[PDB]
């Protein structure tokens, strides 16, 4: 049969993440690395390409034997979910990562917040002669919350190996809380937290009970 499973989750931040864009017409002496933002609302967002990239390259150090020279070489428990372009049976893989926008923009008000993206000055310092080279980079602020909206896609080939899939996705997020969700994360910046995970079926009458107790173990 055919089904669609919706992994809804919240993304809290512990440190503020910096998923970069580039603004070419940024000012002199202003934000030199701005974040990706929504053009209408001007809130920062977490693009799904960055989630699908970090989760794939962190699961590739776990679920691949004979480490991948290219993302065309993932060991087909990983290529099922993420897709190999150079493979006839797994291109257009199972997962659909939606962009997490923001949820708590009202909740950041009444905590006292001028702007939803803070600016951090960051100072290259030369370790000969102590001369400096400052930065100003945007950073989506600390207690933000984003609507993670993964969607898994069940066909007849899926049916006997869904749980082997869901033991990966649940272990993707746990791998990603132990790492940084994009940015300049070697110095803080994007230690992240996936909270209140919830897989609900949205098309096709699939039992989501024996896999929803596995997401909170």
């Amino acid at each position: 049969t055919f089904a669609k499973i919706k992994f809804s989750a919240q993304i809290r931040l512990e440190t503020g993440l910096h998923i970069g864009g580039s603004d070419a017409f940024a000012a002199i002496g202003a934000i030199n690395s701005p974040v990706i933002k929504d053009p209408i609302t001007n809130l920062p967002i977490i693009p799904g390409s960055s989630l699908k990239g970090k989760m794939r390259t962190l699961l590739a150090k776990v679920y691949n034997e004979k480490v991948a020279e290219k993302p065309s070489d993932d060991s087909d428990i990983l290529s099922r979910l993420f897709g190999n372009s150079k493979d006839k049976r797994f291109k257009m893989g199972r997962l659909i990562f939606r962009d997490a926008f923001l949820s708590n923009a009202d909740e950041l008000d009444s905590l006292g917040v001028r702007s939803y993206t803070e600016v951090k000055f960051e100072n290259t310092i030369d370790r000969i002669t102590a001369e400096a080279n400052p930065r100003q980079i945007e950073r989506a602020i600390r207690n933000s919350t984003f609507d993670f909206e993964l969607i898994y896609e069940i066909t007849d080939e899926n049916e006997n190996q869904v749980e082997e899939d869901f033991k990966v996705i649940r272990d993707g997020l746990k791998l990603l809380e132990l790492d940084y969700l994009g940015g300049s994360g070697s110095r803080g910046y994007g230690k992240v937290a996936f909270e209140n995970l919830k897989a609900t079926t949205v098309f096709g009458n699939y039992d989501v009970k024996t896999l929803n107790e596995l997401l909170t173990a």
Partner: protein, 348 residues
């Protein structure tokens, strides 16, 4: 898995300042009680335009008196019977050592998140780790600082390898030392110290008009440090011996040639969170002394010795934890060395 973590418990001694770039200028704070209030000066101007004192305030700012305490912002509010604050609420309690009481000028802000709480950024702590690591290893503290073009003061940034470098597998030692930020601690631990330059070949300590708002000593701040590879993973439980060796080579010169009452003992692993400290904790010190003693033919000349010692005045405070109540300075009149801190590090 291979991600092995560390807790760095950072005992702040000897007040610590970080960041924020900007500064509250003079005439932007009131000293009403025994505490400094720092308004949101746009809202200050809003309420003071509502009371129709805009031209009076613009004539107050450009007008200087022979006394200082009637130029600050409390003298505007008392020469106009202004009684309420209700402004952007932020105030820090004075120590009694900023000094004529409250005639300080141009305090430097401490770095703060969007919620308005101070915190130490892990970017700023992975520079103090990185000077220790770049000073204790003999391979990085070699004849570094390729000049090769124009001005001398550049560094061979490519000596510690960090780029991706196609073909070659990606090592990048300091990608694999992830230092996270602090929890945002309280504004009550901020004390507003001022700079003091203790010279060599001159016994005086001169007060400078710097007013870094700084973390009070004996505050404990927790950092997490995740290491991923084995090579960078081994340099972090060895930060104890490398911090002690960095201090041993740093007490060898520039913490010689000074009286020992200025410097204080540490008793945990010594680190220098950065402000004030200056040019020897920020720098790898030999090529530093050459090319950095070169860089000043100005009025504010870095003089003939290695440097001028950077101290502050801050309230005296004892730990009482070891076998003895440790007085925490070896002098009277409360001179601390700016930016000194201690830490203990622990896996997981």
């Amino acid at each position: 898995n291979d991600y092995r973590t560390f807790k760095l418990s950072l005992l702040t001694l000897a007040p610590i300042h970080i960041g924020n770039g900007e500064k509250y200028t003079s005439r932007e704070f009131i000293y009403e009680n025994k505490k400094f209030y720092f308004p949101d000066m746009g809202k200050f101007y809003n309420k003071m335009v509502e009371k129709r004192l805009a031209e009076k305030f613009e004539a107050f700012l450009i007008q200087t008196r022979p006394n200082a305490r009637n130029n600050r912002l409390i003298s505007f509010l008392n020469d106009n019977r202004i009684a309420e604050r209700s402004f952007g609420g932020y105030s820090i309690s004075e120590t009694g050592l900023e000094s004529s009481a409250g005639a300080i000028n141009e305090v430097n802000k401490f770095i703060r998140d969007a919620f308005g709480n101070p915190y130490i950024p892990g970017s700023s702590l992975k520079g103090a780790i990185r000077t220790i690591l770049m000073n204790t290893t003999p391979k990085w503290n070699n004849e570094n600082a390729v000049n090769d073009f124009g001005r001398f003061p550049k560094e061979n940034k490519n000596l510690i390898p960090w780029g991706p470098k196609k073909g070659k597998e990606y090592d990048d030692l300091f990608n694999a030392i992830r230092v996270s930020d602090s929890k945002p601690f309280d504004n009550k631990s901020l004390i507003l110290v001022q700079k003091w330059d203790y010279s060599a070949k001159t016994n005086k300590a001169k007060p400078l008009p710097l007013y870094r708002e700084s973390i009070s000593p004996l505050t404990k701040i927790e950092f997490e440090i995740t290491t991923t590879t084995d090579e960078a993973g081994r340099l972090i439980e060895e930060l104890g011996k490398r911090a002690q060796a960095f201090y041993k080579d740093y007490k060898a010169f520039f913490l010689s040639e000074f009286p020992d009452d200025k410097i204080q003992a540490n008793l945990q692993y010594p680190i220098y969170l950065g402000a004030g400290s200056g040019a020897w904790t920020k720098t790898l010190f030999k090529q530093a002394d050459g090319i950095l003693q070169r860089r000043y033919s100005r009025m504010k000349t870095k003089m003939v010795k290695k440097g001028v010692l950077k101290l502050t005045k801050a309230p005296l405070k004892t730990v009482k934890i070891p076998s003895g109540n440790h007085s925490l300075v070896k002098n009277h009149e409360s001179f601390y060395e700016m930016g000194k801190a201690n830490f203990m590090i622990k896996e997981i």
